[PDB]
Every structure is written in structure tokens, then in C-alpha cells.
């Protein structure tokens, strides 16, 4: 059985934090669906890179369930994720079936918005800490990648490779992660 | 005066090696044009990420000159770059006016194809070394980023951040590179 990943792509998402996990996960043999929040139309990312999603979120919602739901960062992207009722439904369903939820940079703030994973240890971009911690519902970490139960978080564009490889390791195991890592020419 | 960058995007390009330099260069205030080799139509990258270029290469060619020409990697992308007469013309013109040429991963092999920069020190992805060195026209380096005169090269997806910041430093200087680097949460 092939593992499946849903990446939710909204206007203003950080394009590096989107492309790096999609690419790395596909190198690991995972079936990745890049789903556009607003539909099938091309999405203008935070630095004006324009990416064509594989499907609308509405369509991708019906082809579930997914072994991981991925929330990229970017301040405006995360805000769009935090305001979407469809994202709330997807996240609440993933939580209930004990599937993995992964968010990077500003992305974890959508978890707070949708009341996902309260009590977990999480990290965010430093500039997003105050927002994530409003109410003290999580415990904050400064680790570059943090995993507590089914909640996997990471800090910024420069942690995107470590974030993606942590997803691979969680889904496919350490050996596949190591095999996918070697041809990338990462430092550590 | 605002510095200008041309990124040449061909089918089969490594999407991470494309998006990371475009994003980082735009964070540095550089005006970046993502030009599609085959036209304005959306480009399917090596891991099936689909990116919409800003313009066709034909149109972007007329809005020159550029302070840097950027060649992403990906084996099939580099091959498409190596076979394109338009790329040859762009590169030969950039060489003659002593502008910067930057290529990463498999991308430097297009330089060999177009007889660009013979005698320079270059690096490539390890898997592309034998191809780059056919004929002994360059001297090979295993540095993660290599710069010899106006030729800047780098090794793979995992060196993409260092590659892009080297471009920023060459165009805008060390302080801008350092200022753009800090919010990315890079390790080193």
C-alpha cells in the first residue's frame, strides 16, 4: 500500500515550504496531492511564484483518507488556512483517526485557530511564537523540528528539508529517509 | 538601480533548485524573471510540481540585459537547456559582457554544451561530474558552492540556499545577504 499526503496550498503560502516537502515526499514514493484551497486555479505564493495545484481541496477531500496532512507557512497563507472551515473539517477528521498533521513556519497557527492538538509540544517561526501561544494551549519548543504524538512542526524555510525528511521517516521509516537524503547533498 | 535576474525554466527542471533561488533573490529585492524555455505555458518539473513562468524566454530575451542568468538543475531540464540555441545565445552574450552566470546540480553541464567559461573551476552534482569533465575543459571542485570569475556553480538541491545567497552576495553585497539569511532559520 502506497502512503498518501495532502498538501493544502493557499494564496500567500511560502513557496519554498510548499515545493520542498512535495518534492522530497515524491522522491520517497509517497503519493502527494497538492490541493488548492480556493479551487483548481493557479496559486500565487508569497514571493510570486505561481504553482498549479493537482486538484481542488473539495475534490481532494473526497479521495481521502491521507496518512499526512501538510500545512505550509507564509503569513498570509497560514491566515487563509486558519479562516477556512474546510481546513477545520479536514484537520479535525485527521486528528480523530490519529493521522499525522505536519505544519511549518507560520503554518502551525492554523492548528490553534482550529483547536487542533491542544497540550502538544510545537515549534513555529520565531516571529509566529506569540500568536501560537495565545492562551497557553501548547508548550513551545525551539527545536528545528518538533514531533509530539501526531503533531509534527518546524520553524522556517531553512528547516524545510529536515521537516520533509521527518515526514518521510514517520511514514516510510528511517532507511527510506536515509536513502532519499543522500542524493540531495545536504550538509547534515 | 535594481538588479535583474533571469531564471530559465525548462521541462524536467528540479523544482526545488528553481523556487529556492527565485524566492531568496526576491527577498533580496532583485527583480527576477522566471522565463519558460518553450513559451509562457506552465512547466512540469522533475517531481511533477507545475510552475507558471513570468514570461517566455523569447519575450524575456528582449528585456535584457540581466545581472545574473540562472540555470537550475534536474537531468532532463539541463538536457533541454543544453540543446537550446536560444540558451546558447543568451549565455554567450552574458559571458561577453562579463555578467554573472549561475548553475546548480546538473545545470552546469549546459555550460559545457554551449562552450561557456572553459578553464574555470566548477562544481556539479556528483552524478554529473563525468559529463561536465568530458574533454578536461574545466577544473573540478567538490566545494558546495564554487565561484571562479563570473561562473558560480553549486552541487545539488541541498545546496540551493547557499547557492542563492552567494548570488545575492555577488549582486547586492554581504550585508544584504546576511539580512536576508536571518529570517530563513538556516543552520549555518
mmCIF file of C-alpha atoms in Angstrom:
data_model
loop_
_atom_site.group_PDB
_atom_site.id
_atom_site.type_symbol
_atom_site.label_atom_id
_atom_site.label_comp_id
_atom_site.label_asym_id
_atom_site.label_seq_id
_atom_site.Cartn_x
_atom_site.Cartn_y
_atom_site.Cartn_z
ATOM 1 C CA UNK A 1 0.000 0.000 0.000
ATOM 2 C CA UNK A 2 1.279 3.438 -1.052
ATOM 3 C CA UNK A 3 1.172 6.192 1.574
ATOM 4 C CA UNK A 4 -0.725 9.374 0.687
ATOM 5 C CA UNK A 5 -0.058 13.020 1.525
ATOM 6 C CA UNK A 6 -2.282 16.087 1.253
ATOM 7 C CA UNK A 7 -0.601 19.483 0.888
ATOM 8 C CA UNK A 8 -3.015 22.408 1.273
ATOM 9 C CA UNK A 9 -1.958 25.354 -0.880
ATOM 10 C CA UNK A 10 -3.456 28.793 -0.247
ATOM 11 C CA UNK A 11 -2.675 32.215 -1.662
ATOM 12 C CA UNK A 12 0.302 33.718 0.141
ATOM 13 C CA UNK A 13 1.873 30.384 1.076
ATOM 14 C CA UNK A 14 5.665 30.265 1.311
ATOM 15 C CA UNK A 15 6.542 28.568 -1.973
ATOM 16 C CA UNK A 16 9.794 27.049 -0.711
ATOM 17 C CA UNK A 17 7.962 25.451 2.235
ATOM 18 C CA UNK A 18 5.484 24.020 -0.289
ATOM 19 C CA UNK A 19 7.787 22.699 -3.018
ATOM 20 C CA UNK A 20 10.467 21.171 -0.802
ATOM 21 C CA UNK A 21 8.152 18.741 1.078
ATOM 22 C CA UNK A 22 6.214 17.851 -2.083
ATOM 23 C CA UNK A 23 9.416 17.084 -3.991
ATOM 24 C CA UNK A 24 11.055 15.149 -1.159
ATOM 25 C CA UNK A 25 7.921 13.179 -0.379
ATOM 26 C CA UNK A 26 7.566 12.193 -4.027
ATOM 27 C CA UNK A 27 11.211 11.098 -4.027
ATOM 28 C CA UNK A 28 10.210 8.792 -1.147
ATOM 29 C CA UNK A 29 7.489 7.165 -3.236
ATOM 30 C CA UNK A 30 4.622 8.900 -1.429
ATOM 31 C CA UNK A 31 1.549 9.851 -3.475
ATOM 32 C CA UNK A 32 1.228 13.603 -2.895
ATOM 33 C CA UNK A 33 -1.801 15.725 -3.752
ATOM 34 C CA UNK A 34 -1.221 19.465 -3.882
ATOM 35 C CA UNK A 35 -4.748 20.740 -3.248
ATOM 36 C CA UNK A 36 -5.721 24.345 -3.881
ATOM 37 C CA UNK A 37 -7.751 25.872 -1.069
ATOM 38 C CA UNK A 38 -9.831 28.026 -3.435
ATOM 39 C CA UNK A 39 -10.083 25.598 -6.364
ATOM 40 C CA UNK A 40 -8.033 24.157 -9.228
ATOM 41 C CA UNK A 41 -6.753 27.546 -10.361
ATOM 42 C CA UNK A 42 -3.074 28.552 -10.157
ATOM 43 C CA UNK A 43 -1.949 29.891 -6.770
ATOM 44 C CA UNK A 44 0.255 32.964 -6.319
ATOM 45 C CA UNK A 45 2.676 32.305 -3.489
ATOM 46 C CA UNK A 46 4.244 34.796 -1.112
ATOM 47 C CA UNK A 47 7.221 35.539 -3.381
ATOM 48 C CA UNK A 48 5.056 35.496 -6.545
ATOM 49 C CA UNK A 49 5.980 32.001 -7.657
ATOM 50 C CA UNK A 50 2.800 30.653 -9.264
ATOM 51 C CA UNK A 51 2.072 26.950 -8.718
ATOM 52 C CA UNK A 52 -0.666 24.875 -10.353
ATOM 53 C CA UNK A 53 -2.359 22.549 -7.833
ATOM 54 C CA UNK A 54 -3.117 18.936 -8.676
ATOM 55 C CA UNK A 55 -6.754 19.318 -7.605
ATOM 56 C CA UNK A 56 -9.152 21.485 -5.664
ATOM 57 C CA UNK A 57 -9.385 20.821 -1.945
ATOM 58 C CA UNK A 58 -13.069 19.998 -2.467
ATOM 59 C CA UNK A 59 -12.123 17.193 -4.871
ATOM 60 C CA UNK A 60 -9.112 16.061 -2.853
ATOM 61 C CA UNK A 61 -11.320 15.885 0.250
ATOM 62 C CA UNK A 62 -13.321 13.066 -1.356
ATOM 63 C CA UNK A 63 -10.253 10.935 -2.203
ATOM 64 C CA UNK A 64 -9.140 10.540 1.414
ATOM 65 C CA UNK A 65 -8.005 9.463 3.875
ATOM 66 C CA UNK A 66 -4.396 10.674 3.933
ATOM 67 C CA UNK A 67 -1.517 9.447 6.055
ATOM 68 C CA UNK A 68 -0.321 13.046 6.484
ATOM 69 C CA UNK A 69 -1.889 16.484 6.045
ATOM 70 C CA UNK A 70 0.694 19.177 5.334
ATOM 71 C CA UNK A 71 0.208 22.872 6.104
ATOM 72 C CA UNK A 72 2.883 25.158 4.613
ATOM 73 C CA UNK A 73 3.729 28.506 6.116
ATOM 74 C CA UNK A 74 3.780 32.046 4.844
ATOM 75 C CA UNK A 75 1.917 34.579 6.967
ATOM 76 C CA UNK A 76 -0.941 35.202 4.537
ATOM 77 C CA UNK A 77 -1.126 31.523 3.606
ATOM 78 C CA UNK A 78 -1.495 30.461 7.235
ATOM 79 C CA UNK A 79 -4.169 33.109 7.768
ATOM 80 C CA UNK A 80 -6.138 31.748 4.814
ATOM 81 C CA UNK A 81 -5.751 28.255 6.269
ATOM 82 C CA UNK A 82 -6.873 29.453 9.707
ATOM 83 C CA UNK A 83 -10.064 31.009 8.311
ATOM 84 C CA UNK A 84 -11.149 28.040 6.176
ATOM 85 C CA UNK A 85 -13.947 25.834 7.503
ATOM 86 C CA UNK A 86 -12.885 23.095 5.083
ATOM 87 C CA UNK A 87 -9.416 23.026 6.630
ATOM 88 C CA UNK A 88 -11.021 22.743 10.077
ATOM 89 C CA UNK A 89 -13.045 19.723 8.971
ATOM 90 C CA UNK A 90 -10.029 18.049 7.359
ATOM 91 C CA UNK A 91 -7.838 18.627 10.407
ATOM 92 C CA UNK A 92 -10.474 17.507 12.926
ATOM 93 C CA UNK A 93 -11.040 14.323 10.915
ATOM 94 C CA UNK A 94 -7.306 13.633 10.692
ATOM 95 C CA UNK A 95 -6.944 14.130 14.447
ATOM 96 C CA UNK A 96 -9.814 11.739 15.207
ATOM 97 C CA UNK A 97 -8.345 8.929 13.085
ATOM 98 C CA UNK A 98 -4.863 9.504 14.569
ATOM 99 C CA UNK A 99 -3.247 10.523 11.322
ATOM 100 C CA UNK A 100 -0.186 12.711 11.071
ATOM 101 C CA UNK A 101 -0.512 16.501 10.832
ATOM 102 C CA UNK A 102 2.557 18.492 9.763
ATOM 103 C CA UNK A 103 2.897 22.278 9.749
ATOM 104 C CA UNK A 104 5.877 24.561 9.230
ATOM 105 C CA UNK A 105 6.803 28.170 9.978
ATOM 106 C CA UNK A 106 3.546 30.158 10.335
ATOM 107 C CA UNK A 107 1.525 27.076 9.428
ATOM 108 C CA UNK A 108 1.100 25.777 12.995
ATOM 109 C CA UNK A 109 -1.026 28.821 13.841
ATOM 110 C CA UNK A 110 -3.819 27.208 11.819
ATOM 111 C CA UNK A 111 -3.816 24.439 14.419
ATOM 112 C CA UNK A 112 -4.599 26.945 17.148
ATOM 113 C CA UNK A 113 -7.321 28.519 15.014
ATOM 114 C CA UNK A 114 -8.976 25.111 14.552
ATOM 115 C CA UNK A 115 -8.391 23.878 18.134
ATOM 116 C CA UNK A 116 -6.144 21.044 16.965
ATOM 117 C CA UNK A 117 -3.762 19.184 19.250
ATOM 118 C CA UNK A 118 -4.023 21.267 22.430
ATOM 119 C CA UNK A 119 -1.462 20.156 25.012
ATOM 120 C CA UNK A 120 1.192 19.185 22.468
ATOM 121 C CA UNK A 121 4.752 20.435 22.171
ATOM 122 C CA UNK A 122 5.143 22.523 18.998
ATOM 123 C CA UNK A 123 7.527 24.922 17.316
ATOM 124 C CA UNK A 124 6.944 27.774 14.890
ATOM 125 C CA UNK A 125 8.860 30.502 13.149
ATOM 126 C CA UNK A 126 10.192 32.784 15.936
ATOM 127 C CA UNK A 127 8.015 35.604 14.582
ATOM 128 C CA UNK A 128 4.910 33.424 14.989
ATOM 129 C CA UNK A 129 5.554 32.340 18.594
ATOM 130 C CA UNK A 130 3.350 34.927 20.315
ATOM 131 C CA UNK A 131 0.398 34.070 18.068
ATOM 132 C CA UNK A 132 0.737 30.310 18.583
ATOM 133 C CA UNK A 133 0.971 30.710 22.370
ATOM 134 C CA UNK A 134 -2.094 32.932 22.875
ATOM 135 C CA UNK A 135 -3.893 31.174 25.733
ATOM 136 C CA UNK A 136 -1.113 28.766 26.667
ATOM 137 C CA UNK A 137 -2.737 25.827 24.880
ATOM 138 C CA UNK A 138 0.587 24.392 23.663
ATOM 139 C CA UNK A 139 4.114 24.050 25.032
ATOM 140 C CA UNK A 140 6.721 25.825 22.931
ATOM 141 C CA UNK A 141 9.932 24.298 21.620
ATOM 142 C CA UNK A 142 12.887 25.881 19.870
ATOM 143 C CA UNK A 143 13.919 22.632 18.183
ATOM 144 C CA UNK A 144 14.234 22.924 14.407
ATOM 145 C CA UNK A 145 11.798 20.018 14.052
ATOM 146 C CA UNK A 146 9.409 19.004 16.830
ATOM 147 C CA UNK A 147 7.203 15.910 16.973
ATOM 148 C CA UNK A 148 4.750 15.268 19.805
ATOM 149 C CA UNK A 149 2.354 12.407 19.214
ATOM 150 C CA UNK A 150 0.762 13.010 15.831
ATOM 151 C CA UNK A 151 1.758 16.696 15.602
ATOM 152 C CA UNK A 152 4.927 17.484 13.650
ATOM 153 C CA UNK A 153 6.095 21.079 13.420
ATOM 154 C CA UNK A 154 9.066 23.003 12.108
ATOM 155 C CA UNK A 155 10.349 26.524 12.148
ATOM 156 C CA UNK A 156 11.052 28.122 8.768
ATOM 157 C CA UNK A 157 12.108 27.932 5.117
ATOM 158 C CA UNK A 158 15.596 26.791 6.120
ATOM 159 C CA UNK A 159 14.205 23.852 8.113
ATOM 160 C CA UNK A 160 12.101 22.652 5.178
ATOM 161 C CA UNK A 161 14.417 19.770 4.273
ATOM 162 C CA UNK A 162 14.577 18.462 7.848
ATOM 163 C CA UNK A 163 10.792 18.873 8.122
ATOM 164 C CA UNK A 164 10.148 16.875 4.942
ATOM 165 C CA UNK A 165 12.584 14.093 5.866
ATOM 166 C CA UNK A 166 10.882 13.786 9.261
ATOM 167 C CA UNK A 167 7.608 13.194 7.409
ATOM 168 C CA UNK A 168 9.268 10.510 5.270
ATOM 169 C CA UNK A 169 10.767 8.830 8.338
ATOM 170 C CA UNK A 170 7.381 8.824 10.086
ATOM 171 C CA UNK A 171 5.573 7.306 7.086
ATOM 172 C CA UNK A 172 8.185 5.076 5.430
ATOM 173 C CA UNK A 173 10.866 4.608 8.100
ATOM 174 C CA UNK A 174 14.449 5.625 8.740
ATOM 175 C CA UNK A 175 16.067 3.673 5.899
ATOM 176 C CA UNK A 176 13.920 5.236 3.189
ATOM 177 C CA UNK A 177 14.590 8.659 4.699
ATOM 178 C CA UNK A 178 18.336 7.984 4.614
ATOM 179 C CA UNK A 179 18.184 6.708 1.017
ATOM 180 C CA UNK A 180 16.244 9.758 -0.166
ATOM 181 C CA UNK A 181 18.557 12.110 1.739
ATOM 182 C CA UNK A 182 21.869 11.054 0.222
ATOM 183 C CA UNK A 183 21.386 12.376 -3.357
ATOM 184 C CA UNK A 184 20.243 15.783 -2.063
ATOM 185 C CA UNK A 185 23.713 16.872 -0.930
ATOM 186 C CA UNK A 186 22.583 18.152 2.451
ATOM 187 C CA UNK A 187 25.252 19.275 4.911
ATOM 188 C CA UNK A 188 23.998 17.402 7.982
ATOM 189 C CA UNK B 1 19.168 50.817 -9.951
ATOM 190 C CA UNK B 2 17.501 47.456 -9.255
ATOM 191 C CA UNK B 3 19.474 44.332 -10.173
ATOM 192 C CA UNK B 4 17.814 41.855 -12.542
ATOM 193 C CA UNK B 5 17.906 38.059 -12.685
ATOM 194 C CA UNK B 6 16.849 35.641 -15.417
ATOM 195 C CA UNK B 7 15.886 32.102 -14.393
ATOM 196 C CA UNK B 8 15.487 29.735 -17.354
ATOM 197 C CA UNK B 9 12.835 27.105 -16.661
ATOM 198 C CA UNK B 10 12.629 24.003 -18.854
ATOM 199 C CA UNK B 11 10.578 20.832 -18.601
ATOM 200 C CA UNK B 12 12.215 18.416 -16.181
ATOM 201 C CA UNK B 13 13.933 21.099 -14.105
ATOM 202 C CA UNK B 14 14.435 20.368 -10.410
ATOM 203 C CA UNK B 15 11.648 22.443 -8.875
ATOM 204 C CA UNK B 16 13.411 22.969 -5.544
ATOM 205 C CA UNK B 17 16.502 24.318 -7.338
ATOM 206 C CA UNK B 18 14.180 26.699 -9.208
ATOM 207 C CA UNK B 19 11.947 28.006 -6.415
ATOM 208 C CA UNK B 20 14.606 28.477 -3.744
ATOM 209 C CA UNK B 21 16.801 30.932 -5.734
ATOM 210 C CA UNK B 22 13.778 32.803 -7.113
ATOM 211 C CA UNK B 23 12.289 33.231 -3.638
ATOM 212 C CA UNK B 24 15.567 34.193 -1.969
ATOM 213 C CA UNK B 25 16.538 36.591 -4.730
ATOM 214 C CA UNK B 26 13.164 38.315 -4.494
ATOM 215 C CA UNK B 27 13.634 38.596 -0.728
ATOM 216 C CA UNK B 28 16.863 40.460 -1.567
ATOM 217 C CA UNK B 29 14.991 42.997 -3.684
ATOM 218 C CA UNK B 30 16.200 41.590 -7.008
ATOM 219 C CA UNK B 31 13.803 41.722 -9.970
ATOM 220 C CA UNK B 32 13.556 38.082 -11.070
ATOM 221 C CA UNK B 33 12.076 36.853 -14.341
ATOM 222 C CA UNK B 34 11.198 33.171 -14.484
ATOM 223 C CA UNK B 35 11.316 32.571 -18.238
ATOM 224 C CA UNK B 36 9.874 29.444 -19.815
ATOM 225 C CA UNK B 37 12.163 27.866 -22.391
ATOM 226 C CA UNK B 38 9.265 26.697 -24.582
ATOM 227 C CA UNK B 39 6.904 29.643 -24.045
ATOM 228 C CA UNK B 40 4.548 31.144 -21.461
ATOM 229 C CA UNK B 41 2.813 27.846 -20.746
ATOM 230 C CA UNK B 42 3.040 26.066 -17.374
ATOM 231 C CA UNK B 43 6.135 23.892 -16.897
ATOM 232 C CA UNK B 44 6.070 20.396 -15.389
ATOM 233 C CA UNK B 45 9.128 19.970 -13.204
ATOM 234 C CA UNK B 46 11.024 16.793 -12.410
ATOM 235 C CA UNK B 47 8.849 15.892 -9.407
ATOM 236 C CA UNK B 48 5.630 17.000 -11.172
ATOM 237 C CA UNK B 49 5.343 20.369 -9.476
ATOM 238 C CA UNK B 50 3.852 22.641 -12.145
ATOM 239 C CA UNK B 51 5.118 26.238 -12.199
ATOM 240 C CA UNK B 52 3.782 29.120 -14.294
ATOM 241 C CA UNK B 53 6.620 31.219 -15.766
ATOM 242 C CA UNK B 54 6.510 35.004 -15.717
ATOM 243 C CA UNK B 55 7.235 35.198 -19.453
ATOM 244 C CA UNK B 56 8.514 33.253 -22.418
ATOM 245 C CA UNK B 57 12.266 33.220 -22.916
ATOM 246 C CA UNK B 58 11.690 34.886 -26.294
ATOM 247 C CA UNK B 59 9.999 37.839 -24.573
ATOM 248 C CA UNK B 60 12.403 37.900 -21.634
ATOM 249 C CA UNK B 61 15.322 37.934 -24.086
ATOM 250 C CA UNK B 62 14.219 41.368 -25.320
ATOM 251 C CA UNK B 63 14.043 42.926 -21.826
ATOM 252 C CA UNK B 64 17.727 42.372 -21.052
ATOM 253 C CA UNK B 65 20.428 42.689 -20.001
ATOM 254 C CA UNK B 66 20.465 40.756 -16.721
ATOM 255 C CA UNK B 67 22.983 40.916 -13.903
ATOM 256 C CA UNK B 68 22.720 37.132 -13.477
ATOM 257 C CA UNK B 69 21.464 34.253 -15.624
ATOM 258 C CA UNK B 70 20.372 31.264 -13.548
ATOM 259 C CA UNK B 71 20.312 27.678 -14.818
ATOM 260 C CA UNK B 72 18.551 25.211 -12.490
ATOM 261 C CA UNK B 73 19.366 21.534 -12.473
ATOM 262 C CA UNK B 74 17.381 18.376 -12.971
ATOM 263 C CA UNK B 75 18.797 15.933 -15.504
ATOM 264 C CA UNK B 76 16.108 16.407 -18.151
ATOM 265 C CA UNK B 77 15.964 20.152 -17.521
ATOM 266 C CA UNK B 78 19.703 20.546 -18.065
ATOM 267 C CA UNK B 79 19.490 18.469 -21.241
ATOM 268 C CA UNK B 80 16.767 20.760 -22.583
ATOM 269 C CA UNK B 81 18.947 23.744 -21.687
ATOM 270 C CA UNK B 82 21.975 22.170 -23.381
ATOM 271 C CA UNK B 83 20.076 21.621 -26.644
ATOM 272 C CA UNK B 84 18.549 25.106 -26.900
ATOM 273 C CA UNK B 85 20.125 27.554 -29.346
ATOM 274 C CA UNK B 86 18.413 30.422 -27.521
ATOM 275 C CA UNK B 87 20.163 29.458 -24.290
ATOM 276 C CA UNK B 88 23.480 29.402 -26.170
ATOM 277 C CA UNK B 89 22.905 32.937 -27.443
ATOM 278 C CA UNK B 90 21.884 34.216 -24.005
ATOM 279 C CA UNK B 91 24.877 32.612 -22.307
ATOM 280 C CA UNK B 92 27.398 33.755 -24.931
ATOM 281 C CA UNK B 93 26.071 37.313 -24.654
ATOM 282 C CA UNK B 94 26.244 37.229 -20.854
ATOM 283 C CA UNK B 95 29.825 35.953 -20.999
ATOM 284 C CA UNK B 96 30.882 38.702 -23.419
ATOM 285 C CA UNK B 97 29.502 41.495 -21.216
ATOM 286 C CA UNK B 98 31.056 39.923 -18.091
ATOM 287 C CA UNK B 99 27.779 39.232 -16.363
ATOM 288 C CA UNK B 100 27.274 36.539 -13.773
ATOM 289 C CA UNK B 101 26.220 33.022 -14.796
ATOM 290 C CA UNK B 102 24.958 30.674 -12.073
ATOM 291 C CA UNK B 103 24.169 26.976 -12.471
ATOM 292 C CA UNK B 104 23.375 24.260 -9.950
ATOM 293 C CA UNK B 105 23.404 20.462 -9.824
ATOM 294 C CA UNK B 106 23.120 19.176 -13.422
ATOM 295 C CA UNK B 107 22.753 22.730 -14.701
ATOM 296 C CA UNK B 108 26.478 23.376 -15.248
ATOM 297 C CA UNK B 109 26.523 20.744 -17.999
ATOM 298 C CA UNK B 110 24.708 23.269 -20.195
ATOM 299 C CA UNK B 111 27.829 25.420 -19.936
ATOM 300 C CA UNK B 112 29.910 22.656 -21.476
ATOM 301 C CA UNK B 113 27.319 22.134 -24.206
ATOM 302 C CA UNK B 114 27.479 25.838 -25.113
ATOM 303 C CA UNK B 115 31.270 26.204 -24.688
ATOM 304 C CA UNK B 116 30.875 28.672 -21.825
ATOM 305 C CA UNK B 117 33.652 29.511 -19.387
ATOM 306 C CA UNK B 118 36.297 26.957 -20.384
ATOM 307 C CA UNK B 119 39.217 26.983 -17.949
ATOM 308 C CA UNK B 120 37.114 27.844 -14.900
ATOM 309 C CA UNK B 121 36.793 25.953 -11.637
ATOM 310 C CA UNK B 122 33.284 24.482 -11.320
ATOM 311 C CA UNK B 123 31.294 22.005 -9.277
ATOM 312 C CA UNK B 124 28.288 19.864 -10.137
ATOM 313 C CA UNK B 125 26.140 17.182 -8.608
ATOM 314 C CA UNK B 126 28.464 14.176 -8.048
ATOM 315 C CA UNK B 127 26.406 12.194 -10.570
ATOM 316 C CA UNK B 128 27.060 14.859 -13.222
ATOM 317 C CA UNK B 129 30.847 15.066 -12.770
ATOM 318 C CA UNK B 130 31.835 12.720 -15.604
ATOM 319 C CA UNK B 131 29.632 14.597 -18.076
ATOM 320 C CA UNK B 132 30.949 18.030 -17.075
ATOM 321 C CA UNK B 133 34.573 16.866 -17.330
ATOM 322 C CA UNK B 134 34.397 15.285 -20.803
ATOM 323 C CA UNK B 135 37.437 16.798 -22.524
ATOM 324 C CA UNK B 136 39.038 18.339 -19.448
ATOM 325 C CA UNK B 137 37.809 21.843 -20.273
ATOM 326 C CA UNK B 138 37.142 22.751 -16.623
ATOM 327 C CA UNK B 139 38.780 22.071 -13.265
ATOM 328 C CA UNK B 140 36.527 20.226 -10.839
ATOM 329 C CA UNK B 141 35.780 21.266 -7.271
ATOM 330 C CA UNK B 142 33.933 19.463 -4.508
ATOM 331 C CA UNK B 143 33.040 22.685 -2.693
ATOM 332 C CA UNK B 144 29.316 23.067 -2.038
ATOM 333 C CA UNK B 145 29.423 26.434 -3.815
ATOM 334 C CA UNK B 146 32.191 27.373 -6.246
ATOM 335 C CA UNK B 147 32.838 30.776 -7.817
ATOM 336 C CA UNK B 148 35.575 31.361 -10.388
ATOM 337 C CA UNK B 149 35.446 34.722 -12.110
ATOM 338 C CA UNK B 150 31.915 35.133 -13.417
ATOM 339 C CA UNK B 151 30.979 31.435 -13.131
ATOM 340 C CA UNK B 152 29.117 30.389 -9.984
ATOM 341 C CA UNK B 153 28.210 26.742 -9.514
ATOM 342 C CA UNK B 154 26.720 24.525 -6.848
ATOM 343 C CA UNK B 155 26.100 20.873 -6.280
ATOM 344 C CA UNK B 156 22.512 19.845 -5.541
ATOM 345 C CA UNK B 157 19.061 20.510 -4.083
ATOM 346 C CA UNK B 158 20.508 20.674 -0.568
ATOM 347 C CA UNK B 159 22.980 23.399 -1.571
ATOM 348 C CA UNK B 160 20.233 25.560 -3.076
ATOM 349 C CA UNK B 161 20.110 28.007 -0.165
ATOM 350 C CA UNK B 162 23.882 28.536 -0.139
ATOM 351 C CA UNK B 163 23.816 28.888 -3.940
ATOM 352 C CA UNK B 164 21.093 31.552 -3.841
ATOM 353 C CA UNK B 165 22.741 33.527 -1.027
ATOM 354 C CA UNK B 166 26.005 33.524 -2.991
ATOM 355 C CA UNK B 167 24.110 35.140 -5.872
ATOM 356 C CA UNK B 168 22.698 37.774 -3.505
ATOM 357 C CA UNK B 169 26.143 38.476 -2.048
ATOM 358 C CA UNK B 170 27.628 38.858 -5.536
ATOM 359 C CA UNK B 171 24.903 41.273 -6.685
ATOM 360 C CA UNK B 172 23.929 43.179 -3.530
ATOM 361 C CA UNK B 173 26.807 42.546 -1.111
ATOM 362 C CA UNK B 174 27.452 40.693 2.119
ATOM 363 C CA UNK B 175 25.198 42.771 4.378
ATOM 364 C CA UNK B 176 22.085 42.248 2.273
ATOM 365 C CA UNK B 177 22.880 38.536 2.103
ATOM 366 C CA UNK B 178 23.184 38.409 5.896
ATOM 367 C CA UNK B 179 19.935 40.359 6.380
ATOM 368 C CA UNK B 180 18.011 38.073 4.026
ATOM 369 C CA UNK B 181 19.525 34.963 5.624
ATOM 370 C CA UNK B 182 18.485 35.570 9.220
ATOM 371 C CA UNK B 183 14.683 35.096 8.878
ATOM 372 C CA UNK B 184 15.153 31.823 6.967
ATOM 373 C CA UNK B 185 16.254 29.828 10.019
ATOM 374 C CA UNK B 186 19.208 28.187 8.308
ATOM 375 C CA UNK B 187 21.545 26.074 10.430
ATOM 376 C CA UNK B 188 24.853 27.541 9.239
#
